[PDB]
Amino acid sequence: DNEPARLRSVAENLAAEAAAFVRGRRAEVFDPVTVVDTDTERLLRDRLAQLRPGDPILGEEGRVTWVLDPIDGTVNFVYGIPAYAVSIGAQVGGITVAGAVADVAARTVYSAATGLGAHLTDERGRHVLRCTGVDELSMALLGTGFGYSVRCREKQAELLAHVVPLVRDVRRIGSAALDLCMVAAGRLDAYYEHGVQVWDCAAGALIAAEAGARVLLSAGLVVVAAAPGIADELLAALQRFNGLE
Amino acid sequence: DNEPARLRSVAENLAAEAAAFVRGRRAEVFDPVTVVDTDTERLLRDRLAQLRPGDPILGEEGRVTWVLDPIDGTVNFVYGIPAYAVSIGAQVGGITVAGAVADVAARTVYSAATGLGAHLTDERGRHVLRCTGVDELSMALLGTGFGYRCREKQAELLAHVVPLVRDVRRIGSAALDLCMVAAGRLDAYYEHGVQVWDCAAGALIAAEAGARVLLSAGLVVVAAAPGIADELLAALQRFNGLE
């Protein structure tokens, strides 16, 4: 119809399809990432033309709006680090109503829709996602990334050094979409990145949110996603050093 | 016999076995990591008693010497991030002659022996490992970790090198980082404070893949594609980290 449940199914299906295509195209090809990225963007646009005729598409290169990234984690893709993803978000008035992130190398798909919860789908079927119940920020495993391009990186690194001793450990994986899903699944306790494009966090953000996580999205965005027991304590430490703004 | 080729086979086999056991034990159990870590240590010690009778064993908790870590990446193991490894190194006089690192969730095994090259073994059979041919440190993908107190200084140091490199990866397993360098999935790796049983095997593997590797109670580890090693060592010294 156009309800969240319907929107997430098309999101799940397209994500899974596109993952299969990326997985296959990468093997053939191996600029080279530009090729697969474009090809997969084309696949998604065409499939959306047939499944969702009049719907707007905001791509990485250009009523519900489909916000997408065929390959989030392009560095990872080029190096063969199994941590790149297809992200498909369904937005209405700038709010994400449904979404799906496909972990290409893992052959799994995370998805969610407003009010309906977040699930992970793999060979063993579909599972409910729930973030962790950490209380002490010194017990939290935090993921981060460098957002945008080479400009303004050392400051972000400087900021992180300050938060490093306040937390259990840090992870830097190379994919914003996948970090948001880890938080949802409980593989990270929180995630923080400064400068994330909308098409890389829109889907994941919802997924983490529907998994009970605290999520705030302040040309990129500032993203904070954390288990609820630890969100305030983390936001304070970040503000304390200027990062959540 | 006791030659590198023989030493690496027993390393490969033990790594593969132990990975299978960890993979199984983790599913049962899910302190909880302490349990699996000990159990797997016991498996390796017993198997080494039967395959390599008189050989000394330096474990994470205690003529060739088998240096080993049943689960490198214990935080990863606990959270379900597929990046923990079994590491088995064969040392003679403190020098690593052969080694194997099993990537437990990937179901793959990396191995090497002095003069015999580094290989990766997976479903598609055995492959030769070679690190990348990067020249510009600004083009290099660098992996890091923290080894152990004092963490903020290490982070401070990294912020300085961050703009000199393509991007940074922090995965949670030194054994796996060294193997990623060998495979070409990272261009270099740097960590300050790495126990011997987490880097001995990987260090050899990266080295046998053509990487520049130096090991300065833990150790300082630098492993990099050759075309970029000097340039990286300089930047590190320039901020005090390779010491």
| CA separation for the pair A178, B233 (Å, rounded) | 32
Q: Output DSSP code: residue A69.
A: E
| CA separation for the pair A164, A75 (Å, rounded) | 24
List of residues 6+ apart from B112 with CB closer than 8 A: B8, B98, B99, B118, B119, B129, B182, B204, B205, B207, B208, B209
| CA separation for the pair A186, A141 (Å, rounded) | 10
| CA separation for the pair B201, B102 (Å, rounded) | 10
| CA separation for the pair A175, A204 (Å, rounded) | 11
Tokens of residue B167, six digits:
């991007």
Name the nearest CA neighbour of B60 among B24, B84, B87. Answer: B87
Which residues in chain A have their CB less than 8 angstroms from residue B166's CB?
75
Name the nearest CA neighbour of A126 among A107, A108, A113, A104. Answer: A108
Note the residue count of chain B: 243
Which residues in chain A have their CB less than 8 angstroms from residue B170's CB?
170-173
Task: Tell me if A56 sits within 8 A of A66, measured CB to CB.
Answer: yes
Of the candidate CATH numbers 3.90.320.10, 3.40.190.80, 3.50.50.60, 3.10.20.600, the domain formed by B130-243 belongs to 3.40.190.80
Q: How far is CA A214 from CA A96, A232, A233, in A?
A: 15, 9, 12
Identify how the structure was determined: X-ray
Which residues in chain A have their CB less than 8 angstroms from residue B156's CB?
158, 161
Q: Taking each helix axis from N to C terminus, what angle separates B4-29 and B32-51, rounded to the nearest 10 degrees?
A: 150
Q: Which residue has the tokens 């300089």?
A: B234
| CA separation for the pair A141, A168 (Å, rounded) | 5
| CA separation for the pair A65, B226 (Å, rounded) | 48
User: What residue in B sits closest to A161 (Cα-Cα)?
Assistant: B155
The single-letter code of the amino acid at A182 is: M
Q: Which residue has the tokens 């409980």?
A: A186
Q: How far is CA A149 from CA A114, A152, A219, A220, in A?
A: 32, 8, 11, 10
Resolution, angstroms, 1 dp: 2.6
List of residues 6+ apart from A229 with CB closer than 8 A: A133, A134, A135
Note the residue count of chain A: 245
Which residues in chain B have their CB less than 8 angstroms from residue A146's CB?
162, 167-168
DSSP H or E run through A181: helix A176-185
Could A170 and B167 be called an inter-chain contact, meaning their C-beta atoms sit closer than 8 Å?
no
For chain A, which residues lie within 8 Å of any Cβ of chain B, measuring from their own Cβ?
A: 75, 79-82, 106, 141, 146, 150, 153-154, 157-158, 160-162, 164-165, 168-174, 182, 185-188
Q: Output DSSP code: residue A185.
A: H
| CA separation for the pair A182, B174 (Å, rounded) | 21
Could A157 and B152 be called an inter-chain contact, meaning their C-beta atoms sit closer than 8 Å?
no
Determine the CATH number of domain A130-245: 3.40.190.80
The single-letter code of the amino acid at B19 is: A
B192 CA to centre of own chain: 14
| CA separation for the pair A65, A56 (Å, rounded) | 5
> Smallest Cβ distance to A172: which of B160, B168, B180?
B168
- Which residue of B72, B166, B168 is the best one to mutate when testing the A interface, meaning the one whose CB has the most A CBs within 10 A? B168
Taking residue B54's Cβ as centre, other Cβ atoms within 10 Å add up to: 7
Which residues in chain A have their CB less than 8 angstroms from residue B186's CB?
79
| CA separation for the pair B200, B179 (Å, rounded) | 11
> What's the gap in Å between the CA of B189 and the closest CA on chain A?
14
Residue B217 burial (C-beta neighbours within 10 Å; 0-12, 13-18, 19+) = exposed
| CA separation for the pair B218, B222 (Å, rounded) | 13
Helix (H, G, I), strand (E, B) or coil at A170: strand
Could B146 and A168 be called an inter-chain contact, meaning their C-beta atoms sit closer than 8 Å?
no
List of residues 6+ apart from A36 with CB closer than 8 A: A22, A25, A26, A29, A70, A71, A77
User: What residue in A sits closest to B159 (Cα-Cα)?
Assistant: A157
Determine the CATH number of domain A1-129: 3.30.540.10
Helix (H, G, I), strand (E, B) or coil at A186: coil
Which residues in chain A have their CB less than 8 angstroms from residue B159's CB?
154, 157-158, 160-161
Count CA within 13 A, CB hemisphere, residue A133: 0
DSSP result, A70-139: EEE-HHHHHHT-S--EEEEEEEETTEEEEEEEEETTTTEEEEEETTTEEEEEETTEEEE--------GGG
Which residues in chain A have their CB less than 8 angstroms from residue B141's CB?
75, 79
Could B151 and A162 be called an inter-chain contact, meaning their C-beta atoms sit closer than 8 Å?
no
Name the nearest CA neighbour of A225 among A186, A168, A169, A172. Answer: A186
Taking residue A34's Cβ as centre, other Cβ atoms within 10 Å add up to: 10
Could A172 and B169 be called an inter-chain contact, meaning their C-beta atoms sit closer than 8 Å?
yes
Longest Cα–Cα distance of chain A, Å, equals: 51
User: What residue in A sits closest to B153 (Cα-Cα)?
Assistant: A161
> What's the gap in Å between the CA of B8 and the closest CA on chain A?
26
User: What residue in A sits closest to B172 (Cα-Cα)?
Assistant: A171
> What's the gap in Å between the CA of B46 and the closest CA on chain A?
33
Phi, psi angles (nearest 5°) of residue A72: -90, 120
DSSP result, chain B: --SHHHHHHHHHHHHHHHHHHHHHHHHHH--HHHHHHHHHHHHHHHHHHHHSTT--EEETT---EEEEEEEE-HHHHHHT-S--EEEEEEEETTEEEEEEEEETTTTEEEEEETTTEEEEEETTEEEE--------GGG-EEEEEE----HHHHHHHHHHHGGGSSEEEB-S-HHHHHHHHHHTS-SEEEEEEE-HHHHHHHHHHHHHTT-EEEE---EEEEEE-HHHHHHHHHHHHTTS---
Task: Tell me if B241 sits within 8 A of B214, measured CB to CB.
Answer: no
For chain B, which residues lie within 8 Å of any Cβ of chain A, measuring from their own Cβ?
A: 75, 79-82, 106, 141, 146, 151-152, 154-156, 158-160, 162-163, 166-172, 180, 183-186
The domain ranges of chain B are: 1-129, 130-243
| CA separation for the pair B55, B49 (Å, rounded) | 8
| CA separation for the pair A36, A38 (Å, rounded) | 5
The order of strands in the sheet holding B219-224 is B167-169, B141-146, B188-194, B219-224, B212-215
C-alpha dihedral sign at A38, A42, A45, A51: negative
> What's the gap in Å between the CA of B64 and the closest CA on chain A?
34
* Vertex B114: Cα angle to B113 and B119 (nearest 5): 40
